[PDB]
Amino acid sequence: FQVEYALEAVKRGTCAVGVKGKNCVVLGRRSTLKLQDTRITPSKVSKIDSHVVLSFSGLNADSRILIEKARVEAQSHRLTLEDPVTVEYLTRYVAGVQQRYTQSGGVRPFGVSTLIAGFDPRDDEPKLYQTEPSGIYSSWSAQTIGRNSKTVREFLEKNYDRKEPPATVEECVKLTVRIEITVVKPDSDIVALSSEEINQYVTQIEQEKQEQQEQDK
Amino acid sequence: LGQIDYALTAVKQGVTSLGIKATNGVVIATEKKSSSPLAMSETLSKVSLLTPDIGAVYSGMGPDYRVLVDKSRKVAHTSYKRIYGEYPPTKLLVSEVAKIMQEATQSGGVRPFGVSLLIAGHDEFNGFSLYQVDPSGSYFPWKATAIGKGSVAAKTFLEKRWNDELELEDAIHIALLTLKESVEGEFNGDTIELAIIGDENPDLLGYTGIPTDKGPRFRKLTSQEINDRLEAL
Amino acid sequence: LNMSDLFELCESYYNKDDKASMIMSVEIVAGLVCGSKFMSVSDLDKRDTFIENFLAKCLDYELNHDAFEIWSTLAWWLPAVVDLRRSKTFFCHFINADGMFDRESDATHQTSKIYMLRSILMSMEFRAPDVGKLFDELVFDHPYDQVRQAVAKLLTTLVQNQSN
Amino acid sequence: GRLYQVEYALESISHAGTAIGIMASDGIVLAAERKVTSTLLEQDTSTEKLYKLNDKIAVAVAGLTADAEILINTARIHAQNYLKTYNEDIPVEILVRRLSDIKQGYTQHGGLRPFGVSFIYAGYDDRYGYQLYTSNPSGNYTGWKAISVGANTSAAQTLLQMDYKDDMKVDDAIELALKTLSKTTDSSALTYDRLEFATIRKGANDGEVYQKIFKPQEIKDILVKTGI
Amino acid sequence: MDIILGIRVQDSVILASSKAVTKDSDDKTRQLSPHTLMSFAGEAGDTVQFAEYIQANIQLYSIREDYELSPQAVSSFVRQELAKSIRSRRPYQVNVLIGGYDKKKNKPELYQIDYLGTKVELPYGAHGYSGFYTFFLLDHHYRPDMTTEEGLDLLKLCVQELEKRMPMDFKGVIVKIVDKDGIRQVDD
Amino acid sequence: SSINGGIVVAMTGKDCVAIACDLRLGSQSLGVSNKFEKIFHYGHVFLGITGLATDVTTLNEMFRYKTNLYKLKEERAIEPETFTQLVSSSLYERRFGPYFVGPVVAGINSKSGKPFIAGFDLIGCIDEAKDFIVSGTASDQLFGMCESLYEPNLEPEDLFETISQALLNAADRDALSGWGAVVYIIKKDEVVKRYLKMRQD
Amino acid sequence: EGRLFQVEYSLEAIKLGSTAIGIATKEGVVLGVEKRATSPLLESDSIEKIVEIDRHIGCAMSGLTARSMIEHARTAAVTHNLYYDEDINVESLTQSVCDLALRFMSRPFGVALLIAGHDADDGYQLFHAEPSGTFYRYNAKAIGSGSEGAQAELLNEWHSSLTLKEAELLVLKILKQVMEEKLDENNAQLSCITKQDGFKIYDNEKTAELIKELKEKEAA
């Protein structure tokens, strides 16, 4: 088999989480060695363009090709139609590239899954899509790909509700991971959080858990 | 094991040939095998001139070497010459030959060449040099080396004989002794093919009038010279 | 040595950042438990107190999934080399963990504790302490899939341990 | 979804020579060990394992020679193309990613054997200063402060982890590399004829002479001074 | 025809472009980088095609590297593109001025690139016949340590001279300023 | 060609060479730049290019590319004669599509140590002279000045004066040149670059 | 002997995927597909096994959505409109799809499709196109899981005097029988093709109302 082994290779990758809110999208690193330089590190969340961001899971080298192709396609669409690419168009292009690579023998088409998030230009509706080998792409409001997947998806299902999406962005960012966070906002806004902000969120989560234990235990 | 190992076995089954680099030249020597007195040995050459200063000898399948010599001669003009107006150095020509052999190994539907080449040459800024190119496509510089059938004993003798102060005449003498110790059949000037890369020979240029133009450094010994040298053994 | 340098070394080596340091600390704990055959009564009491404190500090608040692997391996390996009855506080922490089967709790920590207890029970099936109280503490209505799977596996282990 | 060809290439590299790259606060040091000896093989093969891609970037090789030569020629051509296009020296990360993409492409299409070569890049640019990278046949590239590839990778990594500081000098890095190599070679003692050395350092004057490749006499003098 | 002018002052680059197309609100500029702007003049929509192609390439580079190109590299790339264009069928008849602020060296820079692919990097430049009517003032009232306001006044004088002494009515001018904060447009 | 102006002159002295060029760049009558240098060097060989400025820049970039690749592959700097052959071959490769340039090569061979100058036509015909080479829109004036002034075996101090006077007097009679001049005096190990003061600038 | 058994193996698409049923009447053609039960937070709107070829032609599928056939059909329809200033016949489009499958025969290509359409020559038409490069005209046809029982039900029920509403009710009833009950509005998807309105896909409210009407009819 070829698709199943690619999915197995995907399962060995680092966990990635994507969540969409009322007016924002939040996209969610291993233990660096003692002699590893982290000053120059390729962030796991790569922005395809000012309004669409991508987060991979699986083989990094194979994901670089997909990211480069997506960026080139976005620039080509911008040059050909004068309009920046939409989220669904870019997701469909990536899925088509993966599906084309699955055929023609396909010892290993790409062995990587992706999450594409953002906003359509001149619009403020969050868009989140999940792309997997065999060219299958789907839409989600809270998705996870990686080692755990099932546990994180169950946590999101029991916590995230499809009746009142979080209005503010802080609650969307304040997500327990049991870490990199990228926030996408309309009018082509992309913000990558720093280590201090994520540490502050973690300390807030720990203090909230301690308070809950103190109240009830 | 693959095709490269089988080509190496075919090379090991071939005639020996040698190569010895001294301070002021390089010596290449080999034995011509023709177990048929009706056949004429002069019509077949085992040492081929690549450039006026670079020559080659081989061990393995003869027709492959014959094709490779023509390819190397063409690539010495197409790649380096007609651009810089001069013959390539030994290292670059050896690299091009190794590229040809590597492309033969990697190309689909084509078997690798079954020869190993000993290439001797001289160039400015590098002096004299001797290299070995394997069927795989990897080349290695050498001080003194041998290939073919009796290559192990020849290598042992060269290791016991080679030094840093060796001259061209001493290299020729050692090569002749090594050939004599492993000659398959009949040891005379008509069965030995020896060439030297050394000083430029103005008498082989063919014309006079240009002081800067010097003669070739490759020189192929004749049967009479080889017999005279053997008389000194 | 005043028998307390090992305590300080184990405390210093347990850093939740470096996995090798935590592995060394767990190795020190395993050596302390396995070394309970040349000591005296006071030494045994001090070791039991230290083990109780260390297990309370390291396995009650939060697991970063790197110490969990080491502790699960220790729970698998330790009962198979030495008797857990030589220590009065090691097995007690795992058998008497609170909130392990709580329904409305939050999950991952409960599953980790259940798996450690199940590894301890599997390492000694028929020569195990009476733990039948778990048959009353098991919960079949936990709304977490991982907890349900852990409960089912623990029930299977308990059933197997009684069938000799 | 394991890749068996990549694993075979990694195993083949594990039997190759050992290369060490150490990054200091003012320079980078590359060292390599020569293993092939025949008492008649010439040792003047230019530089066997250390290569220059431009005036600012150098590379250390562990693995098959032909693939290394192909990749080095491609990297040189890419660097010259970048220099002609933008009239500026190519950043180290761009060239490293180009070579990594080439390796990844060679590990995906059928009929092409993966490059059984591991690269240690040492470069300098005005965006990040000194940079050290390691690239493998799988196509992944990683930045490091002190890295080792080849035969005794684990022991060399442990030795570097024991005795590495974030504020070392170029001479300190040279001594550390020499001592690490001397304690991991299976040839009893380390000699000048079995060693290749290179340094990339910037002086007080902004000249950026990133092409210091040590001569055998210089290697012998450094070994004598260090005490190996 | 069309007037394109540029002045490099001690901490800024000022670009003036004609607003007439033979429309009166024509913006003959494209923001290549947050700190690099380019003005183009010459033939018909080939200029817009070339500007959009260059802008797309530069945006792709910035997205890939997460690090904007220096003005010198952008100018070299544009010169290479024009030099390739002239030696092939369907060349581009575009003359460009590139004004950019180098953040690494903290310095403004202005480049003038001809349609053939000639780059000079003058302290002040113009494309077309506008150099004839202005280069005297720029040769008399320009200093390397001038401020932004002095450069704006000098550009105002040059524009008034162009209006007075040129038979062609170019329908006003639009002025952009490139400095550390980026690109702004003068609304005067 | 002959729309941007510019002149280059190279002369050979005693164990030294000199190569000088103007600095004017313009669009026909209008002067654009007074800092457009037309002399470049790779390794230890100098090249001056006259004619179309775009082609000058393109040739400079291409020759830097080729010389860097040559240094990387051969582990050795290129000599003036090999560079002359390379330039001639590159120019002839564009037959029927030539670069509208006039190249002149100067330098001292590292090994032999003798000076070398040469010039090229539109399509790469090598002209090797032992006295001087001229190129540009004022080639007739340069020829006259060099024939009148040049002497064999001149010291660098006298060679600099001779070439500077020739270049200045040739440029003063040409409308498309004379916005500043730069002279290189090249010896075995030392190179001196000097800017000249002249009229009209 | 020897024979092309790969084609026969491909034609065994009874387990290919979700059931898709098409019914052709004198007032329109109804296409009904099964909607998979996925995560509640998933946007089920991203699942579209009923696709529009053009205003007068729609398609339905049973296998994986991942495409080339639909794009080729759309391109062929647009090209025919550009070249002849009219709408392409349904049978002509089906033959174009079959030719595309054949050219790109000893190996199957693509998956089975149900193509529905209308034109002034043959009224309303329904065709089944197979990955063997061939097709069949059908008066109602079912593919996917449980296709044999659904086809038997269609044989027993189809009588050439149906209306659009009755066709929709039959499609819903057969889908419920195949999926074994509990099909309110999220386990099925309906679409219609009519001369006036063209190709339309029913929204969730209309499907829920149709399910309510079916339940009321069953209660009687």
The pair phi, psi for residue F37, each rounded to 5°, is: -75, 140
| Of F73, F89, F111, Cβ closest to residue B83 | F89
Task: Give residues with Cβ within 8 angstroms of B66, minimum separation 6.
Answer: none
On whether the CB atoms of residues B106 and D106 are closer than 8 A, the answer is no
Instruction: Name every chain A residue with its beta carbon within 8 A of the beta carbon of C145.
Output: 150-151, 154
In the 8-state DSSP scheme, what is residue D91? P
Which ranges in chain D belong to alpha helices (H)?
4-14, 65-86, 92-106, 153-162, 170-182, 216-226
Q: What angle do CA E23, E29, E33 make, to 5 degrees?
A: 155
B121's tokens: 């040459």
Q: 3-state class of D29 per DSSP?
A: strand
Superfamily of domain A1-211: Aminohydrolase, N-terminal nucleophile (Ntn) domain (3.60.20.10)
What residues form DSSP beta bridges with G199? G193
Q: CA–CA separation, E184 vs A102, rounded Å?
A: 49
Domain span including residue D149 = 1-228
Residues of chain D with Cβ-Cβ distance to A37 below 8 Å are: 23, 132, 143-145
Q: Which residue, A56, A123, A67, is CA-closest to A93?
A: A67
Counted across chains A and E, CB pairs separated by less than 8 A come out at 19
Residue from B106, B119, B151 whose CB has the most chain D CBs within 10 Å, to mutate: B106
Whether the CB-CB separation of G30 and G184 falls below 8 Å is answered with no
Contact between A136 and G64 using a beta-carbon 8 Å cutoff: yes
Largest distance between two CA atoms of chain F: 47
Name the helix (H) or strand (E) containing B148: none
Closest CA to G176 of G65, G62, G32, G40: G32
CA D112-D118-D124 angle, to 5 degrees, is 120
The sign of the dihedral angle between the CA atoms of F91, F95, F98, F102 is positive
b vs e for B147-179, b when ≥16 Cβ sit within 10 Å of the residue's Cβ? bbbbbeebbebbeebbeeebebebbbbbbbebb
B196-210 core/surface letters (b: 16 or more CB in 10 A; e: else): bbbebeeeeeeeeee
Of D175, D186, D180, which is closest to residue D162 (Cα–Cα)? D180
Closest CA to D120 of D71, D60, D173, D69: D60
**Which residues make beta-bridge pairs with G128?**
G114, G136
Secondary structure of G73-124 in HEC code, one letter for each residue: HHHHHHHHHHHHCCCCCHHHHHHHHHHHHHHCCCCCCCCCEEEEEEECCCEE
Helix (H, G, I), strand (E, B) or coil at D70: helix
Specify whether the CB–CB gap between D58 and D96 falls below 8 A: no
Structural domain count of chain D: 1
Instruction: Give the HSE-up count for residue B49: Cα atoms under 13 Å, Cβ half-sphere.
Output: 13
Distances (CA, A) of G39 to A17, A138, A142, C75, G44: 16, 11, 10, 36, 9
Half-sphere exposure of E159 (CA within 13 A, CB side): 22
In a mutational test of the E interface, the residue from F3, F24, F34, F54 whose CB has the highest number of chain E CBs within 10 Å is: F54
**Residue among B197, B176, B169 at smallest CA distance from B31:** B176
Residue B167, domain extent = 1-232
| Closest by Cα among B179, B68, B201 to B122 | B201
Break sites following residues in chain E (C–N > 2.5 A)? 22
Q: Using CA atoms, how far apart are residues C108 and A176, in angstroms rounded to an integer?
A: 12
CA dist., res. C105 & res. C114, Å (int): 14
Q: What is the count of residue pairs from A and C with beta carbons less than 8 Å apart?
A: 14
Asked if D34 and D193 touch (Cβ cutoff 8 Å), the reply is yes
With touching defined as 3+ CB pairs under 8 A, do chains A and F touch? no
User: Do chains D and G meet with 3 or more Cβ pairs nearer than 8 Å?
Assistant: no
Backbone angles phi, psi at A182, to 5 degrees: -125, 130
Residue D7 sits at the chain E interface (C-beta within 8 Å) = no
Question: Most D CBs within 10 Å: which of A37, A100, A112, A113, as the mutation test of the D interface?
Answer: A37
Largest CA distance in chain B: 58
Shortest CA distance from A68: residue in chain E:
E64
Residue A72 contacts E where some CB pair is shorter than 8 Å = yes
User: CA–CA separation, A115 vs A16, rounded Å?
Assistant: 8
Whether A contacts E, i.e. 3 or more CB pairs less than 8 A apart, is yes
Chain F residues touching residue D87 (CB < 8 angstroms):
61
Measure CA E20 to chain center. 16
User: Residue F65 is nearest to which of D46, D53, D84, comparing CB atoms?
Assistant: D84
- Give B203's DSSP letter: G
Contact E131, F30 (CB under 8 A): yes
- Residues shown for chain F: 201
Q: What is the CATH number of the domain that holds G201?
A: 3.60.20.10
- Give the DSSP per-residue string, chain F: --SS--EEEEEE-SS-EEEEEE--EEETTEEEES----EEEETTEEEEEEE-HHHHHHHHHHHHHHHHHHHHHHSSPPPHHHHHHHHHHHHHHTTTS---EEEEEEEE-TTT--EEEEEE-TT--EEE-SSEEEEETTHHHHHHHHHHH--SS--HHHHHHHHHHHHHHHHHT-TT--S-EEEEEE-SS-EEEEEE--TT-
Q: Does B213 touch chain F (CB under 8 A)?
A: no
Instruction: Compute the nearest-CA separation of E156 from chain A (Å).
Output: 34
For residue B92, list chain F residues with Cβ-Cβ distance below 8 A: 73-74
Best CA proximity match to B145, nearest among B135, B133, B136, B137: B133
Strand, helix or coil at A4? helix
Other Cβ atoms less than 10 A from the Cβ of C9: the count is 13
Q: Give whole-number Cα distances, D191 to B36, B217, E50, E95, G41, in Å.
A: 54, 37, 60, 63, 67
Cβ partners under 8 Å of residue B117, min gap 6: B56, B57, B58, B65, B68, B97, B132, B133
Cβ atoms of residues G54 and G78 within 8 Å: yes
Q: Helix (H, G, I), strand (E, B), or coil: what is residue A129?
A: strand
Q: Cβ separation of B85 and F85 shorter than 8 Å?
A: yes
Closest CA to A152 of A127, A178, A117, A174: A178
Neighbours of chain E (3+ CB pairs under 8 A): A, D, F
Q: Where are the alpha helices (DSSP H) in chain E?
A: 46-65, 71-86, 130-140, 148-165
Q: Please, how many CA atoms are within 13 Å of residue B95, restricted to the half-sphere of its CB?
A: 15
Q: Where are the domains of chain A?
A: 1-211
Flag whether residue B84 sits within 8 Å of chain F, measured between CB atoms: yes
CA-to-CA distance for E87 and E94, rounded, in angstroms?
14
| Min Cα–Cα distance to chain E from A98, Å | 21
Do E and C touch, 3+ Cβ pairs within 8 Å? The answer is no
Pick from D196, D215, D201: nearest CA to D36: D196
Subunit contact D40:B159, Cβ cutoff 8 A: yes
Chain E residue whose CA is closest to A52:
E63
**Dist CA D170 CA D202 (whole Å):** 10
Instruction: Using DSSP, state whether D157 is helix, strand or coil.
Output: helix
Tell me the two tokens of residue F121: 């036509």
Contacts of C1 (CB under 8 A, 6+ apart): none
For residues C150 and C159, give the distance between their C-alpha atoms in angstroms, rounded to a whole number.
14
> Closest-CA residue in chain G for A139?
G43
Q: Whole-angstrom Cα distance, residue C102 to residue C99? A: 5
Query: Cβ distance E69 to D86 under 8 Å?
Result: yes
Give SS3 for A184.
strand
Q: What is the CA radius of gyration of chain C?
A: 16
Joined together, the tokens standing for residue E67 give 């690090």
3-state class of B47 per DSSP? coil
- Chosen from F66, F71, F74, F79 to mutate, greatest number of chain B CBs within 10 A: F74
- Looking at the complex, report in whole angstroms how far the Cα of residue A3 sits from the nearest Cα belonging to chain G: 14
CA distance E161 to D148: 69
CB atoms near residue F56 (< 10 Å): 27
CB contact under 8 A, C145 and A150: yes
* Residue E60 with chain A: CB contacts under 8 Å: 71-72, 75
Instruction: Enumerate residues 72 to 131 of chain D having a beta carbon within 8 A of any beta carbon in chain B.
Output: 111
Length of chain E counted residue by residue: 188
Would you mind telling me the total number of residues written for chain D in this entry?
A: 228
CA distance A103 to D11: 30
Whether F contacts E, i.e. 3 or more CB pairs less than 8 A apart, is yes
Secondary structure (3-state) at B38: coil
Alpha-carbon gap, residue D198 to D207, rounded angstroms: 17
Angle of CA points B179, B181, B186, to nearest 5°: 70
Nearest by Cα to G49 from G29, G39, G28, G34: G34
E window 97-116, beta carbon within 8 A of D: 104
Method for this entry? cryo-EM
Check: CB of residue D156 under 8 Å from CB of residue D29.
no
What percent of chain C is helix, strand and coil (3-state, nearest 5)?
A: 65, 0, 35
Residue C143 one-letter amino acid: P
Q: Which of E112, E74, E108, E73 is nearest to E179 (CA)?
A: E108
Q: Which residues of A touch C107 (CB under 8 A)?
A: 155
Chains that touch G (3 or more CB pairs under 8 A): A
CATH number for the domain spanning B29: value is: 3.60.20.10
Q: What is the distance between the alpha carbons of residues E96 and E114, in angstroms, rounded to a whole number? A: 7
Q: How far apart are CA B144 and CA B26, in angstroms?
A: 9
CB pair distance less than 8 Å for A154 and C19: no
- As beta bridge partners, residue E122 has none
Residue of C62, C66, C146 with shortest CB distance to A151: C146
Are F53 and F176 in contact, with CB atoms under 8 Å apart?
no
Nearest chain E residue to A43 by CA distance is E66
- The reply to whether G205 touches chain A by the CB within 8 Å rule is no
Comparing CA positions, the residue from G158, G153, G154, G130 lying closest to residue G61 is G130
Chain F residues interacting with chain B (CB cutoff of 8 angstroms): 73-74, 76, 81-82, 85-86, 89, 111
Per the listing, tokens 């060995």 go with: A12
Residue of chain F nearest D53, judged by CA positions: F72
Give the whole-angstrom CA distance, residue A68 versus residue B92.
Answer: 37
D81–chain A Cβ distance below 8 A for any pair: no
Number of compact structural domains in chain G: 1
- The CA–CA distances, whole Å, from B61 to B46, B65, B102, B135, C161 equal 11, 7, 17, 11, 75
Q: What is the CATH number of the domain that holds F174?
A: 3.60.20.10
Whole-number Cα distances in Å, D214 to D131, D134, D195, D201 = 20, 22, 10, 13
Nearest CA in chain E to F57: E118
CA G192 – CA G186 distance, rounded (Å): 18
Q: Are D181 and D190 in contact (CB under 8 A)?
A: yes
**Domain total of chain F:** 1
- A77 SS3 class: helix
Does the distance separating the beta carbons of F82 and B85 come in below 8 Å? yes
Query: Nearest to residue D52, comparing CAs of F44, A40, F71?
Result: F71
User: What residue in A sits closest to C16 (Cα-Cα)?
Assistant: A31
Residue D167 β-bridge partners: none
> What radius of gyration, in Å, describes the C-alpha atoms of chain A?
18
Contacts of D104 (CB under 8 A, 6+ apart): A61, A62, A64, A65, D138, D139
Strand partners, F50: F102
Distance of alpha carbon E153 from its chain centroid, rounded? 18
Contact E76 D126 (CB under 8 A): no
Question: Measured between beta carbons, which residues in chain B are less than 8 angstroms from residue D111?
Answer: 108
